[PDB]
Symmetry: C3
Subunit: 130 residues, 3 copies
């Protein structure tokens, strides 16, 4: 029986845009959403998945998922999508990573006031301890 956390947006805060996250599914207690980041309390291997739904015209959009721990900062994975010059695209990515207690997980979109959907069905972030 695995520990899990599935998070959806509460609001979008504006080089960078981030998402304030709220839990809608939680089992176990080794992970905690604290506003726009997720704290890791339990060292382990986790499946981490991220989707962002973008509405921006023209430019390449994508999210970057990173870990910052005892002294260093590391990108884990990124999703990238070209947008039509006209409108709509979800960007999903996921992978398996060793996370260390004390780690902070960030999901950042490297554009100002990025037009991201608040919809829980389109933009979400989650974890499964493996």
């Amino acid at each position: 029986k695995h520990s899990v956390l599935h998070l959806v947006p509460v609001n979008i805060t504006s080089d960078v845009t981030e998402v304030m996250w709220q839990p809608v599914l939680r089992r176990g207690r080794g992970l905690e959403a604290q506003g726009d980041i997720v704290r890791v309390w339990d060292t382990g291997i986790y499946l981490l998945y991220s989707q962002v739904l973008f509405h921006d015209v023209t430019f390449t959009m994508g999210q970057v998922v990173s870990r910052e721990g005892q002294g260093r900062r590391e990108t884990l994975f990124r999703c990238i999508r070209s947008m039509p010059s006209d409108a709509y695209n979800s960007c999903y990515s996921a992978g398996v990573f060793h996370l260390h207690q004390g780690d902070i997980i960030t999901v950042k979109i490297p554009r100002a006031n990025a037009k991201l959907s608040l919809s829980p069905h389109g933009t979400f972030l989650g974890f499964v301890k493996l």
Copy 2:
């Protein structure tokens, strides 16, 4: 040892298009494909993943994955992709959700006679009990 179900198309039936599903991998017995829906017999937390391969010209395409249970209907997640005006795009999404026995899982594409691939390598639906 986890219960799992991986499903692929048998045919595509035409506001809405759906897929008739057939199992190609099954372990355990808490899930059942019944034509264009999947019944959940066992309450639990599941990773649910969905890919659809689209061939439509011009318009935004995407699939919507939902649960209908004791009295209510809920979208779980959606995938969205703009299509070139020219041709080809897979749309993958997945997440972790608490499903209740008696639940019906639907995968719907909100366009008439949507040009979806029957290929099992391009359009598929699956579950892993966590």
Copy 3:
């Protein structure tokens, strides 16, 4: 506690382009990267995920993930993405498959000298025994 393998590029080798893979996370011992393929030593059910980050102009890009075992060759899944005529797109796909010891897993891009990113955050391949 699941066996896992997360692999990233070392270099890209040129009808076909493949990736030479190196492990960055490994638990258990039922899987082995050997250059551009992955050998399966342990029969089981695995979540297999693949992302490729493409930089090619114009044409439809995508990767194909296959298994070759005792006498037969089988596509497992593929990801497909149209590219702008202008630039950038990640293609992620994943699914659950029964793999047999002795199996060889391949990730192929069906274009010559495909412009793929070596970045470990953009192009990766992984496995979780279920």
